[PDB]
Design a protein around this ligand. Structure first.
Ligand SMILES: *[B]([O])([O])[C]([C]C1=[C]C(C([O])=O)=[C][C]=[C]1)[N]C(=O)[C]([N])C1=[C][C]=[C][C]=[C]1
Ligand SMILES: [Ca+2]
Length: 263
């Protein structure tokens, strides 16, 4: 069962492109191990967590309500909108939109939530304002990461993402209720079964968020640990290859197995 760094390097040998990885201790924030920690990768759908962090920050500031209902029309729908496409008559609450963006990777939900904050540049401003001067969102879904490769637009680094996720889940950046709501949505993720979850032993906690481009890229962010409580953050990104989705998934699952077996 290869050591995690050995397995990450092997994944990159087999896939082509780059694989980036970091593991942080959740309590201390210390980097436990990493590979390409400071290199840029496309965020893909992993940004949806950060988006909902910004929404929750607005809640905490008295500027938004999770119960506020948003109506939208057929013309607002984009690709990969399995939840929002079923609510054209009734609309969805802000909190429902975050649940759908996080748990189902719903793209229209994410775009609606981006409208609530004024667009991708405002999410960047939110990240900047929490001390992340690396991560940037510039585009909407689904063009995010599909229109001509890393111009630094729509990218993060493993360390920036892991650091920022730790601050959202543990900091007093968010209120206790909002921190808990964010991790609850990640825990309820429905679409990342083939990834880290496939390696997870019974009894363990995981809160995660996956992402994909059609070709070349995959990723996941997670807070996980034994005995029902998260104790570490893991971020894995891969980009730049011509590997199949099955291949990409397999390699993330095998990195997961290594990190669990060598915990
Ligand atoms: B997202 O990664 O930006 C988004 C939706 C999506 C999420 C996931 C996941 O694992 O959470 C898997 C697949 C799609 N990506 C896209 O909209 C992207 N254009 C896309 C579209 C089709 C297939 C793969 C990627
Ligand atoms: Ca290499």
């Amino acid at each position: 069962h290869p050591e995690t760094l050995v397995k990450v390097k092997d994944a990159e040998d087999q896939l082509g492109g780059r694989v980036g990885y970091i593991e942080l201790d959740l309590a201390s924030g210390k980097i436990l191990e990493s590979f390409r920690p400071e290199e840029r990768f496309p965020m893909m759908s992993t940004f949806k967590v950060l988006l909902c962090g910004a929404v929750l920050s607005r809640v905490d500031a008295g500027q938004e309500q999770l119960g506020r209902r948003i109506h939208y029309s057929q013309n607002d729908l984009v690709e990969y909108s399995p939840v929002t496409e079923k609510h054209l008559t009734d609309g969805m609450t802000v909190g429902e939109l975050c649940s759908a963006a996080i748990t189902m990777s719903d793209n229209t939900a994410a775009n609606l939530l981006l409208t609530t904050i004024g667009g991708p540049k405002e999410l960047t401003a939110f990240l900047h304002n929490m001390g992340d001067h690396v991560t940037r969102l510039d585009s909407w879904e689904p063009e995010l990461n599909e229109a001509i490769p890393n111009d630094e637009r729509d990218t993060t680094t493993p360390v920036a993402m892991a650091t920022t996720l730790r601050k959202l889940l543990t900091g007093e950046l968010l209120t206790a209720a909002s921190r808990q709501q964010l991790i609850d949505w990640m825990e309820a993720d429905k679409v990342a079964g083939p990834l880290l979850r496939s390696a997870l032993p019974a009894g363990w906690f995981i809160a995660d968020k996956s992402g994909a481009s059609e070709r070349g890229s995959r990723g996941i962010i997670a807070a996980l640990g034994p005995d029902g409580k998260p104790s570490r953050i893991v971020v894995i990104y891969m980009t730049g290859s011509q590997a199949t989705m099955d291949e990409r998934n397999r390699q993330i699952a095998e990195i997961g197995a290594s990190l669990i077996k060598h915990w």
